[PDB]
């Protein structure tokens, strides 16, 4: 299962990033409607999850409490908005490397709240993976790093909530995805309506209807990814999903750099060898 999930998430999110860059950097005026883009993505993902439930998991009955889904959705939205605000306040690469350090906060929050215990081998493997990924990514005053720290904390809280949900309610992947996406859609729609970006985005889309096409395609990609991601969240737990995401980002960066043939600095060599060492140790004892 793990290789299949890795391959699917990697390719789907690579195409997702390509489409997101194409839409954002089109310069048709400038696209300053990120919030409505996330809202559309959430709506499409919710519709896809409903279709999957109706076609595959009709027999199952959801047992999770609604407030748990609401809490998970608000935590995820808070993480997203904090990361975007930090990116606005801080240079792009630093935000990327900060978001790459998800497993550490996820594990720490899990241990502190759910009282989970992990073997020190897992601790060392996760620390080594995170350090290697950070080192491989370019490595060179506050009030901008605090936002990244808050985003990491909110991501850890989301992981804790998902772990508790799956442990004590056996939540299905499709149900979890659908409910989280519905709550996120509600909150984002309320925020968009209040801020008024809905009308500006609608006028922008009417001026350039072609965007719609890409948007739809873009949204579809996200759906697929979320599915796999949520599967990885349920079958293996949030920590494994975080590690998978970080490793996927590292592999994408490594593939792009080697394709561009950018001189690989020795520090990047140490980073990649460390990432491989940690991944192998985790797999041998995973």
């Amino acid at each position, epitope marked *: 299962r793990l290789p299949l999930c890795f391959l699917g998430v990697f390719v789907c999110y690579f195409y997702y990033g390509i489409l997101q860059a194409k839409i954002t950097r089109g310069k048709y005026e400038t696209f300053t409607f990120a919030l409505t883009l996330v809202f559309i993505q959430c709506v499409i993902n919710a519709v896809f999850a409903k279709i999957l439930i109706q076609f595959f998991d009709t027999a199952r*009955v959801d*047992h999770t*409490r609604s407030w748990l889904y609401a809490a998970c959705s608000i935590s995820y939205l808070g993480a997203m908005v904090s990361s975007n605000s930090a990116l606005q306040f801080v240079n792009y690469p630093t935000q990327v490397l900060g978001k790459s350090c998800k497993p550490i906060p996820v594990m720490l929050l899990g241990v502190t709240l759910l009282k989970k215990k992990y073997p020190l081998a897992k601790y060392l493997c996760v620390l080594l993976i995170v350090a290697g990924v950070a080192l491989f990514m370019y490595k060179p005053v506050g009030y901008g790093e605090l936002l990244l720290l808050l985003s990491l904390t909110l991501d850890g809280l989301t992981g804790v909530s998902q772990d508790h949900m*799956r*442990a*004590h*309610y*056996q939540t299905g992947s499709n149900h979890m995805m659908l409910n989280i996406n519905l709550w996120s859609t509600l909150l984002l729609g309320m925020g968009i309506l209040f801020t008024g970006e809905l009308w500006e985005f609608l006028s922008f889309a009417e001026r350039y209807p072609a965007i719609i096409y890409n948007i739809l395609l873009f949204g579809l990609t996200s759906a697929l990814g979320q599915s796999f991601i949520f599967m990885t969240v*349920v*079958y293996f737990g949030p920590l494994t999903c975080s590690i998978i995401t970080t490793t996927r980002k590292f592999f994408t960066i490594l593939a792009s750099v080697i394709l561009f043939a950018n001189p690989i600095s020795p520090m990047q060599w140490v980073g990649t060898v460390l990432v491989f060492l940690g991944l192998g140790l985790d797999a041998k004892f995973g």
Partner: single-chain antibody
Amino acid sequence: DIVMTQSPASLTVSLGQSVTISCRASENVEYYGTSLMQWYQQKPGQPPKFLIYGASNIESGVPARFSGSGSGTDFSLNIHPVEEDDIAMYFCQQSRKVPYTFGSGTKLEIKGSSGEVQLQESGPGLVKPSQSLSLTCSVTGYSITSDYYWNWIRQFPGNKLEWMAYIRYDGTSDYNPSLKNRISITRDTSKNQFFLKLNSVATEDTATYYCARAYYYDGINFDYWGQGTTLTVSS
């Protein structure tokens, strides 16, 4: 469906001894590292009492004497300082799959021998075979539109429990797939009742029917039970 087997049919123990009751499932009952097991205690002529959920968590208010252990397809319930109070039948239930099942039951015996929810069940005491039947469970002290599953269960002669069906406060209902074609569960919030209807009851349906309230946490737990109503089908 999963079949639960309890190795000791009946155990003879002395006061103060430690007793271990074993239960085994035909299939793994672990869902993401948590064992979906429950243990109930039923005294003679009384509804089963909920004791343990998750195979390791003692229900609040239960004495610390009881404890649960095991994993995979083997579980055990331990009572080290057994007293006269804990003399009853013990049932192990699995909530891993929709047709929740109870073990054959283990009997324990001694040598030398407005502030809560109230449920009341009503129904005919004697019914001829092939006649549609309808039992009504009325709830007082609580509203069936709040967050609680309301289940209909039955116990045959020999103390072999069998969960018939349930309805959630949202109206979502689940049935035992074996009986999904024969029974139907409905509710009436105006009177705060819920009804179970059986079509063409046969002589095999003689049993004591309980209506219980259950909350889902690490599996379905029937914390509160009705007093049970007998039903005898005879020619």
